[PDB]
Nucleic acid binder design. Structure first.
Ligand SMILES: [Zn+2]
Ligand SMILES: [Zn+2]
Ligand SMILES: [Zn+2]
Ligand SMILES: [Zn+2]
Ligand SMILES: [Zn+2]
Lengths: 177, 84, 220, 51, 182, 174, 103, 53, 182, 215, 42
RNA sequence: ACGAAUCUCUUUGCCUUUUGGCUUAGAUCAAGUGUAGUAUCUGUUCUUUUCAGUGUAACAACUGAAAUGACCUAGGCUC
């Protein structure tokens, strides 16, 4: 007497709110690395593009992601390809690599760092992300009161510090650079 | 007395981490300020909910709508729009 | 502090407001929250100074009775729990243990949960608003709902036929008064043998009778 | 002792008074007590006032 | 866990019939550990033990009511999302009147049961039981209900937002953006 | 109005059995069939509510003196005014003579009540109106009847004739 | 601890290092003290990860710790893995009172 | 509303409202009785309610 | 009687309890369990009353601060627990008035246990609040022995805080820096 | 929109999709009586329906409540539903929706209880793929690298995400089931090994059958 | 060195002595959890 | 009134396993602790008329102070 449904997404949404550039993955070359590639994201999916030949070529669409992506920025560590720092509604900081694995280009998580609880809370430091232009630290900021800073390093493996913290009990952040 | 002493000590830590806890002597002014600030975060925060509000207000960009929702957390913002 | 009639005029359901609602620190906020759709009231034993479930009704509480599907496993006959062996004989049963004290059929135990009763549900499951209170008797209520379903006008059971001294095949003793006063108002479509239904239908325990698409994605 | 019972948990109760008793020594304290006496003196009057 | 709950559970439901307190509390405690050990397999057994938890929640002994809501904690967490809301609505109706208890082991077990029921039921339907007590005239009503609100708020700050009983007549500073239609 | 009374019930009759008989008459809403909760025994009667007054009066007319249950015949059945104290009456005045005096000012809802005080005959006389009893105070107070001086005032509840008492009796007479 | 009500958790912002349990505390959830189904590793804060104390068990605070601590499945479903550092700071009156009666 | 009658108990004052006498003073005034009036004592304040009823 | 005294403490005077309780802790006959139970009674009494006068803060430091140097680490932890509970009760203004002559004392033993106790006070109330009291003692051209203890307070703060001492490193270095040329 | 005469499908502005069914107590009354009789007072309702109205007057105005049939967080605001009797000559009806951000999606009813059981088992092993891969890596380091949340990339539990405001009720997420197709054959055989009698080749057959046959 | 007799132990002695008599003190001790046969005799 | 039977009831009398035996009472042997906290009997106490403050959802409880004589038939525009 019940109703059992099967859900499919035929076409994905096209509200791209995150973008970042760099060289994320090697395509068809031995040692050629140029900052021509582009990764755009909606809240729920990521698309990689190439602009080397003067026009937007889609390289790869990825798997179905089940989270609300709130920030996405390129991460270039001093003395590697470019990484993706992401912050979603799971309450964690993710650092991600695009690799080639068994035929296909896919996503690979390198760091999952727990912050506060899940969903879009005003205390969760997932609204503002800003990366040091030399690749030394990730600055994360909530809408209200919390700011976090992670020192990120690479020696044989990507490594983050324990965070540095600002707690400002009534301040609603509007922008960050 | 020690079980009652934990729940008092934990009410303070959770009230600092998450703003909108209350107890028994919460004023309606305090409670409604919590409800408003949570709701404005949601409208700003989910991006479908940004586009729904920005279109139906007829705003000029979606970023002008985000700053309207974030300035509205301030109690002195109704008077700012009224002093133009 | 507002008065009680003053507070009752602000709401759409003034029967929800009581006298102590005017002692609230914010009576206007409290009274509109209570009259919001789907808000359930505070459990009513807050006023009392006794103890929740300490009244006399708990003296009459019966033991647990298994769901009737589980009685089919026959565990009640094999371990009796409702009202033995000396200390020497218990001591002797540890060094020489008896095996097979329970003769339960394992295929019957599994098929109770998974084949016979995959769609089993209890007959009473309190709905959305139904908050439990102390003197509530849920046993009466499932008996009453079952009393309404099975029992029908137009049949009289054998138990009542012994009490009424009205055996089967016979017109019930208010037949003549319904010839003088008439048919029941609350059953327009009742056909009674001997007044508006044939007298050869007056047969056994029955003398009268009421004679007046698939859902989207249903399972095949 | 026409009023002492065991309930569905095996605990001793007085049906007249709605009391609960941990052992039999608590029942003897109850039946020699004045609360059980006033409840006997009410079932006396409520039977002597209505036959 | 090792031999299958269909073998064990009819024997311990029968054993709950015996008129001894420690046996009935031992059956309910043994039923708590069963649903922690079998995780998601619990859902095959929810309807069968709902009349036994009804016998334990309507009893005078607090230890009966401690231990019944300890079962409800494990049950509601492992079977939320499986379609058994009418079992938990029934169980919510029998557990909500124990919100005023004062004993420290009993009220922490009752509150943890309420947290798990708000996942089986969802925050919007659970909170219909709570709104009225937040601004009650009596202080003891108001302490017990804010201790539940604060658990719900830590679990759902963002998800409570569609369910607040705030209207423009009720709330001076009501956000006019909620009434917009696109 | 919706409820009838059933009497002469053998207490071997349960609630399940009562519902069978009375749905042959009309659809039944609720049954309350009281019990002495110590002796666990019904007191020989039930209060049975139907859905409306039309099904109720039908049930009385059909089922009164109709059916025998354990050879006992079932019965079915259905289920503020102005006051003048008069001090120092003449003792020649009858309770029928009080009616002959006081009909000229106002209609009497009851008969008067002559009670003796101190020797001192006094009476409680009942009027259907607050204003028609005022005519008895206007014209008969400090008047001489049967060669004795009578005094007419309001009787005590303090005394009748309040401003709230003037308003509501006007509505009751309506 | 779920059992002793005078124990005090840290609940500071968790860092990157992992909290350890001793052999007597091995397999226990730090929140609810449950022995079954572990889901996520425990991260302690910066101050709890420094010095001689960082090697100690985060539940019983005295013995040296060997294996990693895990939140169970049910504490992760409730979000109690995100509240903060789950390390006990004091020793507690149960531990203290045995120590002084014995010698 | 009931002739300024006094009641010596607060359980009895609550049970007053569903009695034959309080039904009478309400029903003769022009107010049909129900739980919406299971409240006030004053003759006046039940008139501003029922004219909204 | 432990649970009775905790409840009857708020209705008794704090004067009445500490006039009788504190002198037992000074006799030479006392046993190890007898010392623990009376240190435990102080700690349960201090939590409830909360308004503690300046003559009684001093008397508690006379018995509590020598626990901080005891042989076994169990006694030293109960010494730290009292002084942090007394820090929140007495507040910052009262304890510094008490501890100030105790630093200038001629007895080496008193200066030892006062330096250790003030650093427990620093961890309870923040090093930023204790920085001018320490800065005065580290400079202090009046007393030579007051300089020696102002540096020992800083050293015990470093031991108590661990890697937490970096937040206060510029203040704690500014206190001590001239004393290397003394 | 109306799915039937007793069930309706809808969505709100918070990103949820849901179906609501009239209860069978309601549907028996509305079938056996004229519409005027609801207005008249000539309906015999059961006594428990009458007593919840007196007890809960703000709640039980209409005497009946809907039964929540299905619930799902779709994370887009749905601005249209289109109920279709078939899609490209398939058997099943489908109901396709469009969201504000450009989504097109569908809800297909599953008609066999054995189909329902198989697809629930595929969704379940894809849902605890984080837990299954991480605990396997931890066991080898005991007795002989994977981060937590390596299959889900961001670290989010799939049930919790789809239960954002309210629990999921009787929707199988096909998007999670199609991430099985992208996995490598080693990883596909590691996930499938707990399921009894079912091979990897039979899983891929069952997933592909939705897009070839059912729409 | 305690030897404290609560009043329920006094009731168990008198009922126990009514059954077992005055020479069977080890039966009388079998009913008491905390008392010996010489303690009950005394 | 009595010859007189039969049923109900009391007193008197009757009366039931009112110990299976025997010896060196045939002999011998018997209870863990600590830390937190609930529930449940019983004894004992409420001698007060107003008002004020505190207190409570309302009570209650707590802290302060002080009211008696005349008459008429529960009552007093009583003094
Ligand atoms: Zn009794
Ligand atoms: Zn820490
Ligand atoms: Zn340990
Ligand atoms: Zn846990
Ligand atoms: Zn009245």
């Amino acid at each position: 007497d019940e109703l059992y449904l099967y859900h499919l997404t035929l076409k994905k949404q096209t509200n791209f709110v995150h973008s970042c550039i760099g060289h994320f993955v090697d395509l068809e070359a031995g040692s050629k690395r140029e900052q021509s590639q582009l990764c755009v994201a909606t809240e729920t999916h990521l698309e990689l593009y190439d602009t080397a030949d003067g026009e937007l070529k889609l390289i790869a669409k990825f798997q179905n992601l089940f989270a609300t992506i709130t920030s996405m920025k390129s991460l270039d560590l001093p003395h590697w390809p470019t990484f993706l720092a992401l912050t979603s509604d799971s309450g964690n900081l993710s650092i991600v690599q695009i690799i080639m694995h068994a035929g296909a280009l896919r996503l690979k998580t390198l760091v999952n760092q727990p912050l506060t609880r899940t969903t879009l809370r005003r205390v969760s430091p997932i609204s503002y992300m800003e990366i040091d232009p030399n690749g030394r630290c990730i600055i994360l900021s909530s809408v209200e009161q919390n700011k976090l800073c992670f020192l990120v390093d690479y020696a044989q493996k990507l490594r983050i510090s324990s965070p540095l913290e600002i707690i400002r009990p009534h301040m609603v952040t509007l922008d960050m650079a | 007395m020690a079980e009652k002493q934990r729940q008092l000590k934990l009410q303070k830590i959770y009230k600092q981490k998450y703003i909108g806890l209350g107890d028994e002597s919460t004023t309606r002014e305090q409670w409604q300020r919590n409800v408003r600030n949570d709701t404005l975060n949601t409208l700003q925060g989910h991006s479908a909910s940004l586009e729904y509000v920005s279109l139906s207000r007829g705003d000029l960009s979606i970023r002008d709508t985000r700053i309207h929702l974030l300035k509205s957390m301030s109690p002195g913002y109704k008077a700012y729009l009224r002093e133009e | 502090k507002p008065s009680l009639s003053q507070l009752k005029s602000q709401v759409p359901y003034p029967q929800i407001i009581e006298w102590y609602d005017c002692d609230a620190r914010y009576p206007g906020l409290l009274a509109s929250i209570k009259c919001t759709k789907n808000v359930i009231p505070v459990p009513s034993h807050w006023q009392s100074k006794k103890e929740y479930l300490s009244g006399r009704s708990l003296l009459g509480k019966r033991p647990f009775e298994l769901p009737d599907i589980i009685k089919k496993t026959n565990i009640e006959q094999m371990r009796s729990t409702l009202p033995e062996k000396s200390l020497k004989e218990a001591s002797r049963a540890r060094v020489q243990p008896k095996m097979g004290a329970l003769d339960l059929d394992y295929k019957k135990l599994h098929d109770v949960f998974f084949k016979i009763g995959a769609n089993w549900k209890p007959d009473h499951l309190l709905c959305f608003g139904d908050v439990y209170y102390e003197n509530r008797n849920l046993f009466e209520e499932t008996n009453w709902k079952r009393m309404v379903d099975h029992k029908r006008p137009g049949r009289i059971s054998q138990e009542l036929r012994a009490i009424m001294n009205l055996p089967e095949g016979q017109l019930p003793p208010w037949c003549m008064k319904m010839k003088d006063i008439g048919l029941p108002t609350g059953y327009p479509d009742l056909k009674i043998a001997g007044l508006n239904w044939d007298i050869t239908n007056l047969k056994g325990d029955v003398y009268g009778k009421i004679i007046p698409r698939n859902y989207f994605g249903a399972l095949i | 002792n026409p009023y002492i019972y065991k309930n569905h948990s095996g605990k001793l109760v007085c049906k007249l008074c709605n009391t609960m008793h941990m052992s039999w020594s608590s029942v003897e304290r109850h039946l020699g007590g004045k609360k059980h006496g006033l409840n006997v003196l009410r079932r006396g009057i409520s039977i002597e006032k209505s036959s | 866990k090792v031999c299958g709950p269909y073998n064990v559970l009819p024997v311990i439901m029968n054993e709950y019939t015996t008129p001894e307190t420690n046996v009935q509390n031992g059956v309910l405690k043994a039923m708590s550990f069963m649903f922690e050990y079998i995780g998601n397999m619990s859902k095959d057994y929810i309807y069968f033990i709902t009349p036994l938890l009804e016998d334990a929640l309507t009893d005078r002994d607090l230890v009966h009511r401690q231990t019944a809501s300890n079962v409800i904690t494990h049950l509601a967490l492992n079977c939320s999302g499986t379609g058994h809301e009418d079992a938990f609505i029934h169980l919510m109706n029998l557990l909500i009147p124990n919100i005023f208890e004062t004993s420290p082991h009993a009220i922490m077990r009752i509150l943890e049961g309420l947290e798990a029921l708000s996942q089986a039921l969802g925050p919007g339907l659970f909170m219909n039981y709570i709104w009225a007590g937040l601004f009650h005239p009596a202080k003891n009503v108001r302490k017990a209900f804010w201790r539940v609100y604060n658990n719900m708020y830590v679990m759902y700050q963002d998800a409570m937002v569609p369910f607040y009983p705030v209207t423009p007549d009720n709330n001076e500073e009501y956000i006019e953006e909620l009434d917009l239609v696109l | 109005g919706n409820t009838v009374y059933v009497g002469n019930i053998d207490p071997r009759i349960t609630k399940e059995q009562l519902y069978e008989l009375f749905i042959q008459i009309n659809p039944v809403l609720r049954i309350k069939y009281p019990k002495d909760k110590v002796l666990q025994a019904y007191q020989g009667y039930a209060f049975i509510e139907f859905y409306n007054q039309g099904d109720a009066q039908y049930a009385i007319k059909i089922m009164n003196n109709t059916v025998r249950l354990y050879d006992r015949l079932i019965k079915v059945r259905q289920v503020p005014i102005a006051k003048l104290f008069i001090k120092n009456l003449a003792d020649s005045i009858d309770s029928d003579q009080l009616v002959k005096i006081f009909n000229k000012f106002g209609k009497l809802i009851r008969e008067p009540e002559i009670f003796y005080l101190s020797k001192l005959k006094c009476a409680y006389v009942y009027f259907e109106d607050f204003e028609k009893a005022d005519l008895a105070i206007k014209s008969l107070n400090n008047q001489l009847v049967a060669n004795n001086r009578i005094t007419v005032d309001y009787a005590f509840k303090n005394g009748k004739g309040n401003a709230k008492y003037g308003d509501d009796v006007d509505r009751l007479l309506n | 601890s779920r059992h002793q009500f005078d124990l005090i958790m840290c609940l500071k912002q968790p860092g990157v290092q992992t909290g350890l349990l001793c052999e007597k505390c091995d397999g226990k959830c730090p929140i609810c003290d449950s022995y079954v189904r572990p889901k996520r590793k425990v991260r302690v804060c910066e101050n709890c990860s420094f010095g001689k104390q960082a090697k100690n068990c985060i539940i019983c605070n005295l013995n040296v710790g060997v294996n990693d601590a895990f939140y169970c499945w049910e504490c992760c479903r409730l979000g109690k893995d995100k509240d903060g550092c789950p390390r006990i700071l004091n020793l507690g009156s149960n531990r203290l009172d045995r120590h002084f009666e014995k010698k | 509303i009931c002739s300024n009658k006094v009641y010596n108990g607060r359980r009895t004052f609550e049970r007053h409202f569903n009695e034959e006498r309080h039904i009478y003073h309400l029903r003769c005034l022009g107010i049909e009785p129900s739980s919406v009036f299971k409240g006030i004592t004053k003759i006046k304040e039940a008139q501003e309610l029922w004219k909204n009823m | 009687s432990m649970r009775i005294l905790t409840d009857k403490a708020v209705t008794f005077g704090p004067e009445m309890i500490f006039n009788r309780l504190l002198p037992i802790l000074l006799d030479r006959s006392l046993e190890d369990q007898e010392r623990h139970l009376m240190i435990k009674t102080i700690d349960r009494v201090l939590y409830q009353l909360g308004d503690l006068t300046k003559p009684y803060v001093h008397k508690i430091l006379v018995v509590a601060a020598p626990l901080l140097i005891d042989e076994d680490p169990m006694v030293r932890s109960t010494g730290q627990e009292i002084i942090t509970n007394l820090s929140t009760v007495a507040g910052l203004k009262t304890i510094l008035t008490v501890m100030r002559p105790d630093i200038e004392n001629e007895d080496e033993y008193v200066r030892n246990v006062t330096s250790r106790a003030a650093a427990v006070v620093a961890k309870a109330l923040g090093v930023n609040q204790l920085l001018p009291f320490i800065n005065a003692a580290c400079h202090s051209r009046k007393s030579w022995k007051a300089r020696h203890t102002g540096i020992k307070i800083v050293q015990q703060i470093g031991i108590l805080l661990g890697i937490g001492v970096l937040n206060h490193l510029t203040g704690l270095m500014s206190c001590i820096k001239d004393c290397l040329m003394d | 929109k109306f799915l039937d005469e007793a069930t309706v499908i809808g969505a709100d502005r918070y990103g949820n999709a849901w179906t609501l069914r009239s209860p069978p107590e309601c549907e028996k009354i509305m079938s056996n009586h004229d519409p005027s009789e609801l207005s008249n007072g000539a309906i015999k309702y059961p006594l428990d329906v009458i007593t919840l109205q007196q007890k809960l007057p703000n709640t039980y105005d209409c005497k009946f409540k809907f039964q929540l049939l299905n619930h799902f967080f779709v994370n887009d605001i749905i601005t249209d539903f289109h109920i279709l009797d078939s899609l490209s000559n398939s058997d099943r009806p489908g109901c396709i929706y469009m969201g504000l951000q450009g989504t097109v999606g569908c809800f297909i009813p599953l008609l066999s209880k054995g189909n329902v059981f198989m697809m629930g088992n595929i969704e379940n092993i894809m849902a605890e793929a984080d837990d299954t891969f991480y605990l396997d890596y931890e066991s080898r380091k005991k007795n002989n690298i994977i981060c937590e949340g390596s299959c889900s990339i961001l670290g989010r539990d799939h049930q919790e995400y789809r239960s954002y405001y309210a629990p999921v009720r009787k929707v199988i997420d096909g998007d999670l089931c199609e991430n099985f197709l992208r996995l490598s054959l080693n990883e596909q055989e590691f996930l499938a090994k707990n399921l009894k009698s079912v091979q990897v080749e039979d899983i891929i057959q069952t997933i592909n059958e939705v897009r070839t046959n059912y729409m | 060195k305690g030897g404290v007799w609560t009043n329920v132990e006094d009731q168990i002695l008198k009922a126990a002595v009514q059954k077992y008599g005055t020479h069977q003190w080890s039966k009388v001790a079998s009913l008491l959890q905390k008392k010996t046969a010489r303690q009950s005799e005394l």
